[PDB]
Write a protein that binds this ligand. Structure first.
Ligand SMILES: O=C(O)[C@H](Cc1ccccc1)N(Cc1ccc(-c2cc3ccccc3o2)s1)C(=O)c1ccc(Cl)cc1Cl
Length: 558
């Protein structure tokens, strides 16, 4: 079956679309090569439509069914609950697309009778109708990138009322099942640090460790009706209220498997027979399907001690190496086996015998030293993307403050400390918006965060070491350095000279700011400071921050 069928109608833009980095008075204090940064618009949607329209073909051997059985067993221990409507509402993102039925996210969160009535009636349609396809909207995504240009990705999502419904039936499922079914291998249960510790222990649990990541060529399009249905047999293994089983069956037949795509102007763009990105089960399902296809594939290729870490469509496999010549052979089979499951490779996975050489979730493990000179591991990455965006957001406020999200998730990184924290705090001082809560996204979910809190938040996601790390490896430093030369970002020495000033600015502010300049820039000075636990750091409520991803699921918290 073809992943997609087009009618020829264009995927139209809902609003104005900028493709060129806006420039303001602050711009050059960060990135001088403006011709390097751009944003994807609905103008390239046609390209993307071409790269993802293809026919999927699957050959499921016993190794495939073997693993699927194991998973269903563990799945059978899960007892998901049926969210009521109010609860559902209370999980909808304050800035989530409004309903084509007269009410919006603001309406739903508050439980206005308009939204609650409609949802109650949408849910009923799911219980007495298990076939009529549910309409969807297809818009091109606007993401910023560096050149050397990729076509805009495609977002497909059902109406707000249906989204609320998905939660009532699946919210509790997608949060639980993954951990239970895949155990430690489930990547959305780890904070950046725990992810790093998991990969290290796992690397140490091998006499001869050998690893590789596996990138699927546009994974959503590879996903076939069979996958969507198998996913369901898995969900249906849970102890689920009867009404929920129906809704999950109904959502499956009428939505997740496929359905008509409607552009922003109401025209028909075509039909979908693969994964919809805007559904509650997108992240969970992918991860589920990706884990199943890569476990079978492991056995198919006789890989010794197959351990895996799976975050949605991203895959990492650390096993017991059996000889450099023997591994490259194994991986060939593995790729071939994945290809038979409709999970071909975008790039040939290649074996690495060096941990800090594998890239999962666009990141990697690297090393430095804490306050005690002890070797400590942290999660870092190429800063190209993060900065390019931090730049765009320097002259354009976005719904997703990437620079903040980035700082929270990469506090320990050489580039996030010297550049991101400095640059942006400097700007918060001038505007005096040091406490204005701002949105940002982590593993998918949108959180509201106040800048002055960062000190506590960071300590809570990485620990005190995120303020005293030093002697970063030469490999990392050189990468941060190069990327800067590329985008035209001033050298690191310049930033330290600026952080020295921003530190001083924050310190003078006393209070929570004084804490910020105290802990966030304590690396800019020579006479280091004490830095001890933060009293209100143990106050923060971070249980639900990293229990499950919701990328393309309509999720929000505090
Ligand atoms: O230890 C390191 O890896 C870097 C190495 C490094 C090298 C080049 C550019 C940036 C970082 N470094 C070591 C140094 C800190 C200050 C240095 C220095 C020497 C010097 C001489 C004259 C004028 C200013 C100067 O700053 S070297 C740091 O103290 C440091 C640690 C964490 C963070 Cl977030 C930032 C820094 Cl600066």
């Amino acid at each position: 079956s073809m992943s997609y069928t087009w009618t020829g109608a264009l995927i139209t833009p809902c609003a104005a679309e900028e493709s060129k980095l806006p420039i303001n008075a602050l711009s050059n204090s960060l990135l001088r090569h403006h011709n390097m940064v751009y944003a994807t618009t609905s103008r390239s949607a046609g390209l993307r439509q071409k790269k993802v329209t293809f026919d999927r073909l699957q050959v499921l051997d016993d190794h495939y069914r073997d693993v699927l059985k194991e998973m269903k067993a563990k799945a059978s221990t899960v007892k998901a609950k049926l969210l009521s409507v109010e609860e559902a509402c209370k999980l909808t993102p304050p800035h989530s697309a409004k309903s084509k039925f007269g009410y919006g996210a603001k309406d739903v969160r508050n439980l206005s009778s308009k939204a609650v009535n409609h949802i109650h009636s949408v849910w009923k349609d799911l219980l007495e109708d298990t076939v009529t396809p549910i309409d969807t909207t297809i818009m091109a995504k606007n993401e910023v990138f560096c050149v050397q240009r990729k076509p805009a990705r495609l977002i497909v999502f059902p109406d707000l009322g249906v989204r609320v419904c998905e939660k009532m039936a699946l919210y509790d499922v997608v949060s639980t099942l993954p951990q239970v079914v895949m155990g430690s291998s489930y990547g959305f249960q780890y904070s950046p640090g725990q992810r790093v510790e998991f990969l290290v222990n796992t690397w140490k649990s091998k006499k001869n460790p050998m690893g590789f990541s596996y990138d699927t060529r546009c994974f959503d399009s590879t996903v076939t009706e069979n996958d969507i249905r198998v996913e369901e047999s898995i969900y249906q293994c849970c102890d689920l209220a009867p009404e929920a089983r129906q809704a999950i069956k109904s959502l499956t037949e009428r939505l997740y498997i496929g359905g008509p795509l409607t552009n922003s102007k109401g025209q028909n763009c075509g039909y979908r027979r693969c994964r919809a990105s805007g559904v509650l089960t997108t992240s969970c399902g992918n991860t589920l399907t990706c884990y199943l296809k890569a476990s079978a594939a492991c056995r198919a290729a006789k890989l010794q001690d197959c351990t895996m870490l799976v975050n949605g469509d991203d895959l990492v496999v650390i096993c017991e190496s059996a000889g450099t010549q023997e591994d490259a052979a194994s991986l060939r089979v593995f790729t071939e086996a994945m290809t038979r499951y409709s999970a071909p490779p975008g790039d040939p996975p290649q074996p690495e015998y060096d941990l800090e050489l594998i890239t999962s979730c666009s990141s990697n493990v690297s090393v430095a030293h804490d306050a005690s000179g002890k070797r400590v591991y942290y999660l870092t990455r190429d800063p190209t993307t993060p900065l390019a965006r931090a730049a765009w957001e320097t002259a354009r406020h976005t719904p997703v403050n990437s620079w903040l999200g980035n700082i929270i998730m990469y506090a320990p990184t050489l580039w996030a400390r010297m550049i991101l924290m400095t640059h942006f705090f400097s700007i918060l001082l001038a505007q005096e918006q040091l406490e204005k809560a701002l949105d940002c996204q982590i593993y998918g979910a949108c959180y509201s965060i106040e800048p002055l809190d960062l000190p506590q938040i960071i300590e809570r996601l990485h620990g005190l070491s995120a303020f005293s790390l030093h002697s970063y490896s030469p490999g990392e430093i050189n990468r941060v350095a190069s990327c800067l030369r590329k985008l035209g970002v001033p050298p690191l020495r310049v930033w330290r000279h600026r952080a020295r000033s921003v530190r001083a600015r924050l310190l003078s502010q006393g209070g929570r700011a004084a804490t910020c300049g105290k802990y966030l820039f304590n690396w800019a000075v020579k006479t280091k400071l004490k830095l001890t636990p933060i009293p209100a750091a143990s106050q923060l409520d971070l249980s639900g921050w990293f229990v499950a991803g919701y990328s393309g699921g309509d999720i929000y918290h505090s």
